[PDB]
A paper describes a structure:
replaced with W657 and C598 in GH2C, respectively. to specifically accommodate the β-linked AHG residue. generate AOS products, which are substrates for GH2C. AOS by GH117B and GH2C, respectively.
Author numbering: 32 to 451, 459 to 848
Write the structure that this text describes.
Amino acid sequence: SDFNNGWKFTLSDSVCYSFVNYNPSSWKTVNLPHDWSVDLPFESTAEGCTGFLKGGIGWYSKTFDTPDNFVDKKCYIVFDGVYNNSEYWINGRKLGFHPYGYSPFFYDISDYLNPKGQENRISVRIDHSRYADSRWYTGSGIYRETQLIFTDKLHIPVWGTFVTTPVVSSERATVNIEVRVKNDYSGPRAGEVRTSYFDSKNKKVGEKLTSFLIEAGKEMKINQSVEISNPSLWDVDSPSMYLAKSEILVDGNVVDTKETPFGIRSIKFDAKKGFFLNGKNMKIKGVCLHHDASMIGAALVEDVWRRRLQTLKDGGCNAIRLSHNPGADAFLELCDEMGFLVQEEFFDEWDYPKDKRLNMDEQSIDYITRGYCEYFQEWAERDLKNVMLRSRNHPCIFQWSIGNEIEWTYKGCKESTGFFYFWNQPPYSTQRIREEWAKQPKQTYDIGRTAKKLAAWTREMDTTRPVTANCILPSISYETGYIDALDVAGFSYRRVMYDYAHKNYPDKPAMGTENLGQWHEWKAVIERDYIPGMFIWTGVDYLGEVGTKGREWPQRAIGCGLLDLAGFEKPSFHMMKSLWTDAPFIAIYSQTANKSSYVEKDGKFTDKDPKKPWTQRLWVWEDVNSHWNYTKGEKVVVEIYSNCDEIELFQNGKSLGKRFLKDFEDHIYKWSVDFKDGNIVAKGKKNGKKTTSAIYTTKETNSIKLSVDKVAVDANNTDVIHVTAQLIDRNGRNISWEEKEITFNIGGNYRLLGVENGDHLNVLNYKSNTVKTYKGRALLVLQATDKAGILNINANSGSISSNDLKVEVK
Ligand SMILES: OC[C@H]1CNC[C@@H](O)[C@H]1O
């Protein structure tokens, strides 16, 4: 009996759909979360900024009976995210409107419920007709989970606790909680708040009892403090979680309860020395993530994200930037449990709109790009705070970011620099910048004033995490009062400004908040103790931000991600793994000496194009080869991404010679090689400890190798199976040099989530059991249902057959 199951949905729109007497039984049944945009095909006539998928106007409905014991109680319906411009009705009557696609909210439906036993009905209209109102793919509908909460009239409201730990040592932590208590009875009520604390193994480690008297219709804040001895500290390598169980008592009887998971950890940003987690000075190995996972779209399916994060974590990542909007509660829960530090961003724009198709300031105006900027003046406060009410207990969250690249949207910011920029500092001095800024004409809104209001609102809700922002032009935001509102200046693609921040504003902590997946970005981080990390754009590829010149149909994604749309490890991931992890590691790629970005003359490698050198490489990694399957005798440049200080390369057993990481300024081991069928083997050492990796020439495609991440799942409507298809030759050696059209067949009760191959440059039907491979591989994503049973999975490509998999559903 989960409230998220058995919803009705339709991609239509009629005025009668909310009426007391309208029956939606003819509508399709769905389980939340749901994103309808991915059930529509990739169209050439949709907008590339939102991933070539239309929105439209859609509706949901949900019936539920009033409990037999709904007397002296309240009812709250809670949404964690609905995209967007959504309207809410219960039993014929309007509850309200909610513009923003990413903030959570709730309605008090207590007085609307029909008497004990009888049926109630919620209706949601979603207006995603403005299907280009975003620079990236959004999806459509109730894409995060919902809740139906019943409480006593004396109760902790929704999100009614805030747990903090202002003193943290290894002997003890001071753990404070604020329990709000609302009395919705018509007379005064006396009681007690009992809050019990519990560890990893459910042993009670603390307790506090406080008395209260609260007047009719008033809300009271009860603060309680305890000392937790020898705490298990939450860390990225040891994410231990505690539980606060706060109970409201009348007489001696529990009348309401809230459970507040939390962690005990200290965080500190030091402007001279860097970032400190529980007293360990560590670098932030961050990645940026949008909210979609391809076949599922915006629908928050946890197992799908678990796999992607596990991969990211195996690559060394310890932090996540939620670009450029509030994340899902369930995603933050995943981060608490798995161990990532999380920057949650409130907005992508404030007073003035960005161009949705092109980046930066809005140049054109049309109906379908009309976004949240229309509601920002009235809604920014309610939204920012609700996000924080919802999010603030999660130990993962270590930064609140009030805005991304805002400077583009205000007349005078870019002008007041000297630039009109990636690779230079500004030609104007700090005073000259300030003088230019004073010379610009007054707009209706100011970047500084709005920064202050947002920073101030933020601090009313939480002072235990720093305020930051991703500043694209720090030089001017240092002078407008914007950076002055922040505790941590975040720099979008400004490694060339780290020395400038230290020199000119040393007492303000600074950091990479958006960066390129390249060694030259990380070199700049580890050479500076005052720059504690970076956040790569992006950790995993995402739908949208295409359709521009150079990236026309049928391209869906940019390909800037470390992981592709299937969550498979790309070349850029293995470079970062070679920089972010310590256990010895070698990845072997190559290109034709023609296609390679490097060239050997006199036994020494340099960049081909000196106007495109290694220090200026941008978002998308070159299309390099993992195979060893060229034509005989062709000249090849083997490029290796490794943490080994010495590697020796063998071609069929003949030693090509040892090389040293010290000799390669761009952190890439290189060899010139004359291709002949066989194998390449790299043997390397990282301070004495050895490791070996190799690639093999294969014969033509023989079989389909199928792997499964789990051989058993539960019949809970939510567990995911990820099936990986990989082409192999007669001897089982992996193919990546030719593609095949693979048809999966599955027996037993399952729900298809879909198929992906990781090709950013080409569309495909998500809902087909057939998928073309990319780099010899593909992914099929299935989901458990109500029905237990066995699933028999196999595949073919005409002649080409496969091994057979069996997965139980318990
Ligand atoms: O792909 C380029 C990126 C630049 N910085 C902001 C991101 O949202 C994105 O537009």
